[PDB]
Design an enzyme around this catalytic site. Structure first.
Site, PDB file in Angstrom:
ATOM      1  N   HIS D 195       0.801  -1.216   0.000  1.00 54.57           N
ATOM      2  CA  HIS D 195       0.000   0.000   0.000  1.00 54.57           C
ATOM      3  C   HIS D 195       0.837   1.271   0.000  1.00 54.57           C
ATOM      4  O   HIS D 195       0.265   2.366  -0.027  1.00 54.57           O
ATOM      5  CB  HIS D 195      -0.947   0.028   1.211  1.00 54.57           C
ATOM      6  CG  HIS D 195      -1.869  -1.148   1.283  1.00 54.57           C
ATOM      7  ND1 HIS D 195      -1.428  -2.427   1.544  1.00 54.57           N
ATOM      8  CD2 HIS D 195      -3.212  -1.239   1.126  1.00 54.57           C
ATOM      9  CE1 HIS D 195      -2.457  -3.255   1.544  1.00 54.57           C
ATOM     10  NE2 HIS D 195      -3.552  -2.559   1.295  1.00 54.57           N
TER      11      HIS D 195
HETATM   12  S1  FES Z   1       1.089  -0.678   4.162  1.00 55.62           S
HETATM   13 FE1  FES Z   1      -0.662  -1.886   3.478  1.00 55.62          FE
HETATM   14  S2  FES Z   1       0.421  -3.780   3.958  1.00 55.62           S
HETATM   15 FE2  FES Z   1       2.180  -2.573   4.618  1.00 55.62          FE
END
Ligand code: FES
Ligand SMILES: CCCCCCCCCCCCCCCCCC(=O)OC[C@H](COP(=O)([O-])OCC(O)COP(=O)([O-])OC[C@@H](COC(=O)CCCCCCCCCCCCCCCCC)OC(=O)CCCCCCCCCCCCCCCCC)OC(=O)CCCCCCCCCCCCCCCCC
Ligand SMILES: CCCCCCCCCCCCCCCCCC(=O)OC[C@H](COP(=O)([O-])OCC(O)COP(=O)([O-])OC[C@@H](COC(=O)CCCCCCCCCCCCCCCCC)OC(=O)CCCCCCCCCCCCCCCCC)OC(=O)CCCCCCCCCCCCCCCCC
Ligand SMILES: CCCCCCCCCCCCCCCCCC(=O)OC[C@H](COP(=O)([O-])OCC(O)COP(=O)([O-])OC[C@@H](COC(=O)CCCCCCCCCCCCCCCCC)OC(=O)CCCCCCCCCCCCCCCCC)OC(=O)CCCCCCCCCCCCCCCCC
Ligand SMILES: CCCCCCCCCCCCCCCCCC(=O)OC[C@H](COP(=O)([O-])OCC[N+](C)(C)C)OC(=O)CCCCCCCCCCCCCCCCC
Ligand SMILES: CCCCCCCCCCCCCCCCCC(=O)OC[C@H](COP(=O)([O-])OCC[N+](C)(C)C)OC(=O)CCCCCCCCCCCCCCCCC
Ligand SMILES: COC1=C(OC)C(=O)C(C/C=C(\C)CC/C=C(\C)CC/C=C(/C)CC/C=C(\C)CC/C=C(/C)CC/C=C(\C)CC/C=C(\C)CCC=C(C)C)=C(C)C1=O
Ligand code: HEC
Ligand code: HEM
Ligand code: HEM
Lengths: 86, 64, 426, 245, 295, 58
Positions: D195
């Site tokens: 992400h």
């Molecule tokens: S930021 Fe979404 S899994 Fe590490």
């Protein structure tokens, strides 16, 4: 000073030997009525020619061994390490 | 608040309050006097019947 | 349902709270408090069983291991199991003492009907729950209990068409049977609380610690004046039980009745049928089955015992005719030259001696019946204990026959004395 | 004392152990309603306990009321002590008990790891990052803007051995648990790719949606980086005593 | 009510009439520190018992319901117990219920959390290896004639010879303490068999005593928790004895005080008639009597 | 005259009950079994290990 000095004598148990073999003979005399009853029962069973399978010289022997062991076992257990000595 | 916390306790001695009242007049006069006979008869009969049963069991197990 | 007129009490929270906050109890003794002890033991059984339910997985092959492991890793679990077992024992003790006390006071009158039957029904249900509880142990004792119960259930259907399957699947303890019986046990155990509440509400209509009608009108307020005494009497009886158990049962024992609970279903296949024995409270029924080798007659004896225990007020009660009911008499008809006999009236408790003799004979017969196991291995090959047969037959006769209860001899003798005295004094 | 009271009560004249009237007694209330008339010949009372059962303390009756309340309090206190034991049993049944803490001690040698390298190890069945930071790297990390940092409470633990500080952290992303990128050119730290969560070389949260830094791993360095004792942090659990004796 | 003492049934408990069951409890009193008044397990005894169980008798028997970690406060410490138990291996076939937790596919050293399995995978394997007779599982073995003594007696009662009329098949041995006095276990305890870590002399009675203490310790009701629960019983009984007088004050003296009532009855001869008595009264169960009784 | 203060008094009496019935029995029980503790066994094992280690061969 108690328990800090040498022990004068060592038992069978203190030497790692089993004393029940001799203690059985030691305690045999007092359980004589049951031994005689067992002997009489064995003699009768030997005499019988047609003996019911239920008959057995087992319950008299059970009583005899019970009386022998009632004296044999506590004497040995009282001498063992881990139990408050008598 | 104006009465004894434990009224009429141990009036007299142990004999009158306990031995004579709580035992002769409360335990015997009320309870034992009523059931001593039937309970004794039942207890004795049960003892005798159990002894006969055990003697038959002995005869079964022990011969000679 | 026009036949059902209504309910004695509406068990609503508002009305229950008001009733128990305004309740009054007359002065009493310890003998008339076994009902409270039974109810308190029921409450503790509910709590402890709820605690146990969160530990018992209803799979038969895991119950022993789960019980053994959860006693160590979790604190107080074995304490709750011990509390549950001892609560069952004390519940049976209190219930039977209550039954004997209420039989003693001749509570078979019509005004006691609602009080009596509502109680017996509870007792009856209290039996069923106990049975289910045994099954949850998943030992050889549970196996034998389930097998006997399944055979009794199948007796009514003449062994046709597996009508028992919906509960006793295959007549064996498995996952389905254990799950169903455990859930039914929980539900009926909680239903027992409501049944006990209904019985307690009903019985207060005419409550008496002794048969004699004391003229006292003042009464204790229940909440604390009576409740404190009830709790204290419970404490005293518990102390006595602790002393008796401590001295009668040495720490290590030889040849206990729990030795048949060694075998665990699944782990051990072979069953030591030589030593088969249930808990002491179900001991009398197993003893009856051994004494009466006939299956149908044994089942009939059990059913008759329970149901005649239920219908005491009808056979022995006034029957609303005010003692003008006419009995059926075998031999007394020849002596009196009358086909029937009017029910006798003077059947007091404390005064008369025949009532006490018969009642204590019945109580001692019950105790003797629960005293030991007939040991059916050769109990019939060897002429069985005559005391057991005598006690069973006297139990059957005492419960049901009205010549051992409300006897005619007392009434006839009293009338003879009345006639003689009136003639002498005119 | 008790003996004196027993002696006083020993010499009491009573009928078969009961303190009752030896003669009929009739009491009439002088202020009764005019229609009541005289007392009937019926002997309603056999005992005079209404008067005999009296400690004549009409003055200071509140003291006896307080004494009765105190006795009631003692009785209720005993009953409540038993009830409290029962409640302890119930709540302890519901709330589990950790009888003992299972072993988690471990050792990993970090000296072999070249400086400025991140290695993944399996500890407690979980990935863990072991890193070595040079002096230049640490100095570069310091003086950076604090706006990016999003953890005021969190800190950084740096070992001192092997001539270069050694850091051990949990290799689990705080967002959802995915494994972050081990090295990035812009900053040789950690930046999750699933992400886009961005961490720094100290594992702090810099300009990243994740709101927490990488959990730290309890460890103590000995033997100059050869013996890194790693044991899970121990938290209290009571009652700890399993046997009274 | 009265049970004969020579039938072979103790206190009327029929069965077990082909065994010696009264030794040590009813006839003779073997001393065990656990069951004495205010007694407790001897830590050294249970330690040596586990030592002997591990070095021998763990090759045929086991405690499937139990696990080693029970010995973490009175018999062993965590590190010592782990080191001792790491001398044995468990294949995944041993596990009673893997449940996806046990991911091993080969033998591995046991841990203190592992249940005490025998070297065999199943009961049938042990039964096959031991001449067709299964070494009984020692978990829940408390339920045997004599209780804790049962382990001690059988381990030692190999001295008597069978009477006339009793035949011991080849591979079987006579032991009066076992059911029907025939047991498939060859005598295992021999002097010097196990070298204790504390140097205690290793005589067969001592080894039997230690084994019995350990086996009892591993039980649940008569095991490691019984002494503390007995002390708790003593404390509760003392509390009840102390609370009895206050119960008496609250209940019986209070009732006696409430009954200290003075009653008076007078002669009311005014014109008023007792019409309330003649026409009055309410019965809560009147609905059960209306239309049913006295009509 | 303060009902919650009297409730605190009842709590104190229950605490006294618990401690009176608890402390003596626990004290006597753990005094009786002083020599059965694990520490005694550990000390005996340590002494035996030392004695065996000092007297031995290569
Ligand atoms: S930021 Fe979404 S899994 Fe590490
Ligand atoms: C099969 C088995 C065999 C058979 C079994 C049989 C079983 C039988 C069971 C029987 C049960 C029923 C018994 C009934 C008894 C009735 C007695 C009676 O007549 O009382 C009436 C009497 C008053 O009646 P009355 O008719 O109104 O009086 C008329 C008078 O003329 C005028 O009255 P008054 O107005 O003057 O009096 C008002 C009253 C009103 O006062 C009150 O209400 C105040 C009450 C305060 C209670 C405080 C409790 C404190 C507890 C903790 C103490 C510390 C413990 C420390 C422990 C460790 C020590 C090292 O005050 C007093 O009388 C003051 C007296 C008390 C003095 C203060 C001490 C109180 C506590 C004493 C007990 C605790 C001792 C601890 C140990 C000490 C060392 C050995 O009631 C009382 O006063 C009761 C007082 C409280 C007594 C409690 C006793 C408890 C004992 C526990 C300890 C036991 C020994 C130690 C054991 C140790 C090991 C565990
Ligand atoms: C997610 C979170 C959710 C929330 C969680 C939290 C839930 C909170 C629930 C709150 C409930 C409030 C109840 C209000 C009434 C309470 C009593 C009262 O008035 O207090 C004044 C009272 C003032 O002191 P006082 O002047 O000495 O008076 C004492 C008498 O109680 C003074 O009584 P009295 O002699 O003047 O007369 C007593 C009674 C006359 O006697 C009776 O008639 C008794 C009742 C008869 C029928 C029931 C029979 C069974 C007895 C009740 C159940 C007891 C066992 C409960 C077990 C629960 C499960 C474990 O007359 C009445 O008061 C009639 C009404 C009785 C209460 C029922 C109606 C109101 C409450 C319920 C209304 C709603 C309906 C219920 C369902 C609602 C569902 C949402 O306060 C206290 O004394 C409180 C003492 C508390 C400390 C001692 C006990 C501590 C526990 C020790 C064991 C270990 C645990 C330690 C604690 C741990 C932390 C909790
Ligand atoms: C650290 C805590 C500090 C706080 C204070 C702690 C102490 C508090 C003591 C409180 C009193 C406890 C005893 C009385 C309980 C009742 C209280 C009460 O109702 O009083 C209010 C009230 C008295 O009014 P009060 O004058 O305002 O109150 C004064 C206080 O109560 C005070 O009265 P007192 O001073 O006159 O009390 C003298 C008593 C208490 O003095 C003490 O506190 C000292 C206790 C020391 C014990 C030491 C034990 C060993 C441990 C220590 C060892 C190391 C040291 C050795 C030193 C050696 C030095 C050479 O000393 C005795 O031991 C002599 C008693 C007579 C000998 C009886 C022997 C036993 C007979 C048992 C028969 C049971 C039969 C049942 C079954 C029947 C049917 C078959 O009582 C009555 O009116 C009741 C009268 C009607 C009932 C009479 C029943 C007589 C027969 C039964 C006696 C039962 C108790 C026996 C106790 C034996 C010692 C434990
Ligand atoms: C009628 C009730 C019983 C008869 C006597 C009358 C008792 C009531 C009179 C007042 C007594 C007030 C003082 C009591 C103090 C007792 C202290 C004690 O022993 O506990 C300390 C201990 C305190 O423990 P601890 O915190 O020191 O340590 C616990 C950890 N271990 C076990 C390793 C030591 O109490 C408990 O923790 C016990 C909780 C039990 C919860 C579940 C209930 C189990 C049954 C308990 C009672 C068993 C006896 C028989 C009961 C019969 C009725 C159900
Ligand atoms: C349904 C009505 C009430 C029924 C009463 C019967 C008991 C019901 C228990 C279940 C419901 C509990 C709801 C509250 C949740 C918190 C529980 C708790 O104490 O926390 C444990 C938790 C967990 O305990 P823990 O952390 O030691 O254990 C969990 C972790 N292990 C297993 C590793 C040990 O402890 C706390 O953090 C609590 C600290 C504060 C203590 C004071 C709490 C006051 C509020 C609750 C009082 C409840 C009194 C009940 C009395 C009943 C009497 C019959
Ligand atoms: C013939 O066959 C049959 C049977 O078998 C023979 C049967 O048994 C039966 C009957 C039996 C059944 C249908 C099975 C029923 C089983 C029963 C009742 C057994 C269980 C009994 C109990 C007393 C269980 C008690 C359980 C507990 C106390 C657990 C407490 C747990 C919890 C979570 C309590 C706290 C939580 C709540 C109250 C929920 C409130 C909401 C929250 C907390 C929100 C939390 C979330 C957020 C976000 C805040 C029938 C009908 C039948 O026909
Ligand atoms: C393999 C050689 C074994 C060793 C080592 C030990 N035992 Fe054993 N035991 C073994 C078998 C094959 C049997 C079955 C005997 C039979 O006839 O069924 C047993 C049985 C026991 C029993 C009786 C179990 C029962 O349910 O009655 C006991 C009490 C027992 N064994 C104890 C015991 C002890 C104390 C040992 C040394 C610590 C021991 N066994 C070692 C096989 C083997
Ligand atoms: C008056 C109420 C109850 C009675 C009379 C009763 C009866 C019994 C009995 C006789 C046993 C077997 C005990 C033994 O064999 O030694 C038992 C076990 C059990 N009962 Fe109940 N019970 C009651 C309430 C409950 C309740 C309400 C629950 C659950 C909510 C419950 C859950 C259990 C469980 C889980 C077991 C088995 C525990 C185990 O095997 O470890 N009981 N019950
Ligand atoms: C679990 C089962 C039972 C519970 C919980 C219970 C509960 C109670 C309680 C609390 C009382 C009041 C206290 C007392 O009278 O001692 C009571 C009274 C009574 N019980 Fe029960 N009881 C049970 C079983 C029985 C049985 C088996 C019978 C009869 C066979 C019965 C018949 C009665 C009667 C008639 C009364 C009133 C006595 C009277 O009027 O003097 N109960 N019951």
């Amino acid at each position: 000073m108690s328990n800090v000095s040498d022990a004068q004598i060592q038992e069978w148990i203190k030497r790692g030997e089993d004393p029940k073999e001799f203690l059985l003979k030691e305690c045999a005399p007092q359980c004589t009525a049951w031994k005689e009853k067992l002997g009489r029962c064995e003699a009768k069973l030997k005499s019988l020619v047609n003996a019911d399978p239920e008959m057995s010289c087992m319950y008299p022997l059970r009583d005899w061994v019970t009386c022998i062991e009632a004296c044999v076992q506590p004497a040995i257990t009282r001498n063992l390490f881990g139990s408050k000595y008598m | 608040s104006n009465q004894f916390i434990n009224f009429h306790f141990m009036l007299g001695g142990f004999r009158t309050y306990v031995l004579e009242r709580f035992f002769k007049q409360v335990w015997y006069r009320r309870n034992i006097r009523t059931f001593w006979f039937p309970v004794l008869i039942s207890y004795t009969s049960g003892c005798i019947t159990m002894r006969m049963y055990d003697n038959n069991c002995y005869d079964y197990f022990y011969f000679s | 349902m026009e036949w059902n007129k209504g309910t004695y009490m509406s068990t609503s929270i508002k009305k229950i709270v008001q009733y128990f906050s305004v309740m009054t109890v007359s002065f009493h003794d310890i003998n008339s408090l076994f009902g409270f002890f039974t109810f308190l033991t029921i409450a503790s059984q509910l709590v402890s069983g709820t605690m146990l339910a969160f530990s018992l997985v209803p799979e038969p092959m895991l119950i022993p291991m789960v019980r053994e492991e959860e006693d160590v890793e979790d604190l107080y679990t074995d304490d709750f199991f011990w509390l549950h077992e001892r609560g069952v024992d004390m519940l049976f003790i209190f219930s039977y003492f209550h039954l004997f006390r209420k039989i003693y006071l001749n509570n078979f009158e019509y005004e006691q009907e609602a009080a009596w039957k509502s109680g017996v029904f509870t007792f009856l249900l209290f039996q069923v729950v106990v049975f289910l509880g045994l099954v949850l142990c998943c030992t050889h004792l549970s196996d034998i209990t389930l097998a006997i119960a399944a055979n009794l259930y199948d007796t009514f259907f003449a062994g046709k068409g597996k009508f028992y399957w919906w509960i006793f699947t295959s007549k064996e303890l498995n996952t389905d049977t254990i799950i169903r019986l455990a859930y039914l046990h929980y539900v009926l155990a909680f239903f027992l609380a409501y049944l006990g509440l209904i019985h307690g509400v009903d019985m207060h209509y005419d409550w008496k610690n002794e048969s004699s009608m004391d003229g006292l009108e003042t009464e204790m307020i229940w909440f604390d004046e009576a409740l404190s005494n009830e709790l204290g009497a419970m404490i005293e009886i518990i102390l006595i039980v602790m002393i008796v158990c401590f001295f009668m049962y040495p720490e290590p024992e030889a040849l206990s009745y729990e030795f048949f609970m060694w075998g665990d279903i699944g782990f051990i296949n072979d069953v030591r049928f030589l030593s088969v024995a249930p808990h002491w409270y179900f001991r009398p029924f197993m003893a009856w089955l051994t004494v009466c080798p006939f299956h149908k007659i044994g089942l009939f004896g059990l059913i008759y015992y329970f149901f005649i225990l239920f219908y005491q007020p009808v056979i022995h009660g006034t029957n609303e005719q005010n003692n003008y009911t006419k009995r059926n008499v075998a031999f007394v008809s020849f002596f009196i030259n009358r086909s029937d006999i009017m029910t006798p009236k003077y059947h007091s408790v404390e005064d008369n001696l025949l009532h006490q003799i018969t009642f204590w004979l019945f109580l001692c017969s019950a105790l003797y019946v629960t005293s030991y196991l007939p040991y059916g291995r050769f109990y019939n090959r060897i002429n069985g204990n005559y005391g057991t047969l005598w006690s069973f037959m006297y139990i059957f006769f005492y419960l049901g026959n009205s010549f051992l209860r409300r006897p005619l001899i007392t009434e006839l003798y009293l009338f003879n004395a009345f006639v003689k005295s009136k003639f002498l004094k005119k | 004392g008790v003996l004196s009271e027993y002696n006083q009560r020993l010499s009491k004249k009573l009928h078969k152990g009961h303190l009752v009237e030896d003669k009929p007694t009739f009491f009439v209330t002088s202020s009764r309603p005019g229609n009541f008339g005289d007392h009937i010949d019926f002997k309603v009372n056999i005992d005079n306990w209404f008067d005999e059962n009296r400690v004549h303390n009409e003055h200071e009756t509140d003291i006896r009321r307080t004494q009765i309340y105190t006795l009631n309090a003692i009785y209720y206190g005993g009953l409540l002590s038993f009830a409290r034991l029962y409640a302890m049993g119930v709540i302890g049944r519901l709330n589990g008990w950790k009888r003992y803490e299972r072993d988690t001690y471990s050792e990993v040698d970090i000296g072999a790891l070249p400086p400025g390298e991140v290695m993944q190890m399996v500890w407690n069945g979980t990935p863990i990052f072991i890193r070595r930071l040079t002096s230049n790297e640490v100095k570069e990390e310091n003086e950076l803007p604090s706006n990016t940092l999003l953890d005021k409470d969190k800190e950084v633990i740096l070992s001192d051995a092997g001539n270069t500080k050694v850091i051990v952290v949990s290799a689990v992303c705080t967002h959802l648990g995915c494994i972050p990128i081990p090295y990035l050119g812009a900053y040789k730290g950690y930046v999750c790719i699933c992400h886009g969560s961005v961490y720094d070389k100290f594992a702090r949260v810099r300009q990243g949606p994740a709101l927490l830094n990488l959990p730290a791993i309890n460890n103590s360095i000995h033997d100059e980086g050869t013996l890194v004792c790693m044991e899970q942090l121990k938290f209290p659990h009571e009652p700890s005593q399993r046997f009274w004796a | 009510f009265i049970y004969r003492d020579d039938i072979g049934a103790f206190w009327g408990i029929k069965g077990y009439e082909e065994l010696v069951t009264e030794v040590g409890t009813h006839k003779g009193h073997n001393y065990w520190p656990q069951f004495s008044f205010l007694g407790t397990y001897d830590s050294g005894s249970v330690r040596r018992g586990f030592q002997v169980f591990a070095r021998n008798c763990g090759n045929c028997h086991g405690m499937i319901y139990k696990k080693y970690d029970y010995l973490l406060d009175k018999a062993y410490r965590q590190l010592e117990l782990a080191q001792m138990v790491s001398d044995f291996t468990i294949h995944p076939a041993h596990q009673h219920f893997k449940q996806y937790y046990y991911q091993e596919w080969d033998e591995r050293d046991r841990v203190i959390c592992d249940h005490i399995y025998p070297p065999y995978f199943s009961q049938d394997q042990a039964k096959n290896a031991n001449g067709g007779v299964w070494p009984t599982d020692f978990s829940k073995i408390k339920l045997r004639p004599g209780g804790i003594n049962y382990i001690y007696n059988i381990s030692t009662g190999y001295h008597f010879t069978p009477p006339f009329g009793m035949d011991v098949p080849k591979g079987k041995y006579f032991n009066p303490y076992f059911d029907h006095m025939i047991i498939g276990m060859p005598r295992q305890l021999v002097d010097g068999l196990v070298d204790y870590d504390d140097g205690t002399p290793a005589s067969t009675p001592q080894m039997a005593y230690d084994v019995s203490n350990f086996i009892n310790f591993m039980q649940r009701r008569v095991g490691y928790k019984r002494p503390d629960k007995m002390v708790r019983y003593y404390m509760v009984f003392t509390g009840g004895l102390l609370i009895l007088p206050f119960k008496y004050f609250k209940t019986k003296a209070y009732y006696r005080n409430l009954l200290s009532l003075r009653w008076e009855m007078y002669a009311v001869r005014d014109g008023v008639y007792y019409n309330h008595f003649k026409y009055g009264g309410y019965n809560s169960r009147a609905y059960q009597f209306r239309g049913y009784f006295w009509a | 005259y303060y009902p919650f203060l009297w409730q605190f008094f009842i709590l104190g009496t229950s605490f006294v009950w618990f401690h009176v019935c608890y402390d003596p029995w626990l004290a006597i029980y753990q005094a009786n079994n002083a020599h059965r503790s694990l520490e005694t066994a550990l000390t005996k094992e340590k002494a035996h290990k030392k004695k065996l280690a000092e007297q031995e061969e290569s």
